[PDB]
Amino acid sequence: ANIVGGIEYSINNASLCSVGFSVTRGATKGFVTAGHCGTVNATARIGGAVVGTFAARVFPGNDRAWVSLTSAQTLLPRVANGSSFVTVRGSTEAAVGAAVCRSGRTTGYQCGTITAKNVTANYAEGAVRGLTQGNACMGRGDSGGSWITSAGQAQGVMSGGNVQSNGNNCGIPASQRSSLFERLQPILSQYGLSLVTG
């Protein structure tokens, strides 16, 4: 399969999440995603085919993971925006106030701004600290998906947010949204990963 940020993948033929970013670890191909999406060794599938397994994850506390892919997979420096693509050019972290977008299999490509950093989320499993908050909307299933600026700077992966009864927070104003992502930089260094760029 072609690995693009924002696309759907399943975990152990059960839960669905979204791809964060194509990365390499030496000769090994992979993609970063959210830790809550799967446990170590869990099988990832795209288009009905096995593409790899969860190599490592930290959740709760943090919310990160990377899926180690088979060499048959095709890594791409891109994030889905409708039928088009946003090129991944680097991982410069944007400041509070910056515009930012996210991509996922539930709500697609959504944009907003970064409103706060170092935010704690109290999830069912425990607290996750150090998350960055934006007001682009999201929904259940967008988890693990790419957060990236229009200029191509990869920011992080979708962790969680204040989803309403309809499963997303797109039906409430941006001012009331808390959409949280796990910063990309600590994921890359923790697992010795290099972002695939173009």
XYZ file of C-alpha atoms in Angstrom:
198
model
C 0.000 0.000 0.000
C 0.917 3.669 -0.458
C 1.542 5.330 2.910
C -0.019 8.808 3.078
C -0.840 10.829 6.198
C -4.500 10.848 7.130
C -5.528 7.560 5.543
C -7.380 4.811 7.396
C -5.784 1.647 8.751
C -7.215 -1.042 11.047
C -5.649 -2.618 14.132
C -6.055 -6.392 14.684
C -9.082 -6.352 12.365
C -10.912 -4.195 14.905
C -10.319 -0.500 15.663
C -9.670 2.078 12.973
C -7.157 4.933 13.146
C -5.411 7.313 10.737
C -1.797 7.336 9.543
C 0.355 10.120 10.975
C 3.503 10.335 8.822
C 5.766 8.142 6.703
C 9.139 7.673 8.444
C 12.272 5.510 8.231
C 14.400 3.920 10.962
C 17.562 2.958 9.146
C 16.451 0.479 6.460
C 13.080 -0.073 8.167
C 9.974 1.626 6.742
C 7.221 2.817 9.066
C 4.603 5.381 10.006
C 4.013 7.286 13.230
C 0.550 7.312 14.770
C -1.146 7.571 18.193
C -0.233 5.153 20.977
C -3.865 4.573 21.937
C -4.417 3.051 18.470
C -2.652 -0.217 19.225
C -0.455 -2.325 21.472
C 3.017 -3.638 20.613
C 2.845 -6.380 17.924
C -0.737 -5.465 16.924
C -1.312 -5.964 13.184
C -2.013 -2.977 10.918
C -4.022 -3.368 7.692
C -4.688 -0.969 4.794
C -7.007 -1.874 1.903
C -7.623 -5.259 3.483
C -3.936 -6.231 3.407
C -1.432 -6.581 6.259
C 1.088 -3.721 6.036
C 3.016 -4.103 9.281
C 2.821 -4.266 13.063
C 3.094 -1.868 16.012
C 6.788 -1.726 16.900
C 6.448 0.468 19.987
C 4.006 2.722 21.832
C 3.602 4.897 24.918
C 0.006 5.415 26.105
C -1.138 6.875 28.464
C 1.363 9.401 29.923
C 2.243 10.199 26.311
C 0.236 9.178 23.237
C 2.594 7.926 20.523
C 3.464 4.887 18.428
C 5.110 3.756 15.262
C 4.130 0.927 12.976
C 7.010 -1.039 11.406
C 6.076 -1.797 7.777
C 7.053 -4.587 5.385
C 9.495 -3.535 2.627
C 6.680 -3.881 0.068
C 5.002 -0.722 1.379
C 5.482 2.614 -0.389
C 6.473 5.518 1.840
C 5.379 8.947 0.641
C 6.139 12.501 1.886
C 2.467 13.420 1.812
C -0.700 14.077 3.780
C -4.211 13.661 2.336
C -6.258 16.797 1.594
C -9.422 15.556 -0.125
C -8.247 13.938 -3.361
C -5.089 16.111 -3.281
C -1.925 16.178 -1.131
C 0.060 18.378 1.230
C 3.797 17.721 0.866
C 5.719 17.006 4.062
C 8.716 19.337 3.996
C 10.034 19.157 7.553
C 9.073 19.151 11.236
C 9.596 22.757 12.347
C 7.300 23.197 15.367
C 4.821 26.060 14.943
C 4.064 28.540 17.723
C 0.776 29.274 19.483
C -1.257 31.428 17.113
C -0.128 29.620 13.957
C -2.602 28.174 11.464
C -2.509 24.386 11.313
C -4.481 21.601 9.648
C -5.097 17.946 10.406
C -6.006 14.906 8.294
C -7.957 11.789 9.293
C -10.384 9.138 8.048
C -13.449 10.492 9.868
C -13.578 14.236 9.299
C -10.994 14.474 6.543
C -8.827 17.582 6.262
C -9.684 20.341 8.739
C -7.901 23.579 9.557
C -7.727 26.003 12.436
C -5.107 27.528 14.723
C -2.886 26.405 17.582
C -4.378 27.799 20.804
C -2.260 26.284 23.591
C 0.628 23.947 24.457
C 1.482 21.532 27.283
C -2.158 20.574 27.794
C -3.183 17.545 29.864
C -5.952 15.238 28.671
C -7.653 13.012 31.243
C -8.606 9.997 29.174
C -10.352 6.849 30.383
C -6.957 5.088 30.648
C -5.146 7.849 32.523
C -3.688 11.292 31.914
C -1.697 12.200 28.807
C 0.421 15.311 29.343
C 2.207 17.769 27.075
C -0.318 17.864 24.273
C -0.704 20.782 21.884
C -4.190 22.189 21.414
C -5.718 23.463 18.212
C -9.237 24.454 17.196
C -9.449 22.582 13.859
C -12.292 20.078 14.396
C -11.962 16.287 14.541
C -13.889 13.111 15.312
C -13.535 9.523 16.544
C -11.296 7.684 14.115
C -9.138 10.716 13.236
C -6.791 9.460 15.993
C -3.194 9.055 14.883
C -3.721 11.329 11.895
C -1.430 14.087 10.691
C -1.309 17.629 12.054
C 0.620 19.757 9.537
C 0.878 23.402 8.475
C -0.081 24.365 4.912
C 3.625 25.048 4.330
C 4.339 21.368 5.009
C 5.785 21.392 8.502
C 4.658 18.207 10.291
C 3.448 19.077 13.818
C 2.254 15.888 15.429
C -0.384 13.170 15.553
C -4.042 13.350 16.589
C -4.531 12.274 20.221
C -7.995 13.353 21.325
C -10.507 16.103 21.844
C -13.864 17.242 23.124
C -16.050 15.213 20.763
C -19.793 15.771 21.132
C -22.646 13.218 20.928
C -22.286 13.051 17.120
C -18.710 11.814 17.548
C -16.882 14.969 16.512
C -16.479 18.591 17.555
C -17.181 20.055 14.106
C -20.728 21.003 15.137
C -19.612 23.526 17.766
C -17.709 26.804 17.159
C -13.915 26.847 16.890
C -13.850 28.900 20.119
C -15.289 25.883 21.983
C -13.037 23.221 20.450
C -10.181 21.443 22.168
C -8.475 19.219 19.599
C -5.241 17.770 20.995
C -2.177 16.391 19.277
C 0.985 14.660 20.430
C 4.060 16.656 19.282
C 6.035 14.976 16.513
C 9.565 15.820 17.644
C 9.656 13.638 20.790
C 8.201 10.715 18.811
C 10.948 10.991 16.182
C 13.757 11.129 18.760
C 12.295 8.509 21.061
C 12.305 5.931 18.266
C 15.216 7.231 16.192
C 12.941 8.032 13.255
C 13.484 10.229 10.220
C 10.581 11.909 8.501
C 10.104 11.128 4.775
C 10.068 14.550 3.058
C 9.675 16.005 -0.429
